[PDB]
Amino acid sequence: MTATVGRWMGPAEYQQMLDTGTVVQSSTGTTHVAYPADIDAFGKQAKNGAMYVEFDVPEKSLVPTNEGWAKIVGPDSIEGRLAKRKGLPVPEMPTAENITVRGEKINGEVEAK
Amino acid sequence: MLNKFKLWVSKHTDYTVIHNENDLSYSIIIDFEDDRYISRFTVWDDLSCMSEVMDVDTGLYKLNKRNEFSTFDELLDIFDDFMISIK
Ligand SMILES: NC(=O)c1ccc[n+]([C@@H]2O[C@H](COP(=O)([O-])OP(=O)(O)OC[C@H]3O[C@@H](n4cnc5c(N)ncnc54)[C@H](O)[C@@H]3O)[C@@H](O)[C@H]2O)c1
Numbered sequence: 278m279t280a281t282v283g284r285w286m287g288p289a290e291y292q293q294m295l296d297t298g299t300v301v302q303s304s305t306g307t308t309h310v311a312y313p314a315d316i317d318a319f320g321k322q323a324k325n326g327a328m329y330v331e332f333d334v335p336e337k338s339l340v341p342t343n344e345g346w347a348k349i350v351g352p353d354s355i356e357g358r359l360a361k362r363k364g365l366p367v368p369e370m371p372t373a374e375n376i377t378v379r380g381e382k383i384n385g386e387v388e389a390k
Numbered sequence: 391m392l393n394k395f396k397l398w399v400s401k402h403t404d405y406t407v408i409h410n411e412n413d414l415s416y417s418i419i420i421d422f423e424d425d426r427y428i429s430r431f432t433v434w435d436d437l438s439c440m441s442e443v444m445d446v447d448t449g450l451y452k453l454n455k456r457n458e459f460s461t462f463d464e465l466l467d468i469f470d471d472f473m474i475s476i477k
């Protein structure tokens with residue numbers, strides 16, 4: 278019940294993700310990912326120095342869209358805050374398997390690494 | 391965009407602005423929660439924003455839209471929808 282996703286992230290997030298083998302929760306409260314994993318989907322707006330990392334998460338932790346991206350449901354996601362209020366089990370950030378750096382943003386253009 | 395939005399919110403509104411600072415991105419989030427709605431408006435420095443309003447009773451989203459804009463006027467009209475969506 279696993280799905281491959283891609284995320285443009287900074288060095289610090291990548292390091293944390295690698296050290297824990299767990300998806301880092303965005304400081305916005307909801308971590309967004311490309312689904313299906315696509316290096317160009319959100320590369321345009323990714324800043325210089327960002328890395329495009331692909332990894333595998335459980336399907337049950339994704340909420341997909343028709344627009345090529347998905348939410349990862351963590352404690353501070355809207356779904357997570359609902360669960361807290363209703364007295365349901367609050368979902369934790371999922372594991373990240375097969376972590377692979379597939380690209381970098383260099384000089385304003387999407388490099389493939 | 392973020393700084394004039396911060397000022398706009400401060401001037402026209404009581405909502406609390408949270409600033410997130412990361413090595414590559416600035417962003418702003420506005421959390422609001424009451425009896426009927428759990429809601430959040432997120433705006434990024436990359437000219438995009440996210441509008442989330444969850445109805446507590448049903449557990450289904452009232453508003454759940456991702457927007458890319460290119461103008462401060464466009465941002466305000468989007469935020470206006472989010473505001474109207476609460477009260
Ligand atoms: N990042 C992606 O690849 C991706 C995927 C699909 C859609 N999007 C869209 O792009 C826009 C911006 O999303 P985003 O993912 O860049 O925003 P974000 O706020 O989640 O991340 C922005 C930057 O901050 C860093 N960051 C955030 N939280 C961090 C933490 N706790 N610790 C360390 N570093 C942290 C990230 O690594 C990144 O460099 C939104 O409109 C979103 O829907 C992004």
Ligand SMILES: [Zn+2]
Pocket residue numbers: 402
């Ligand atoms: Zn005014």
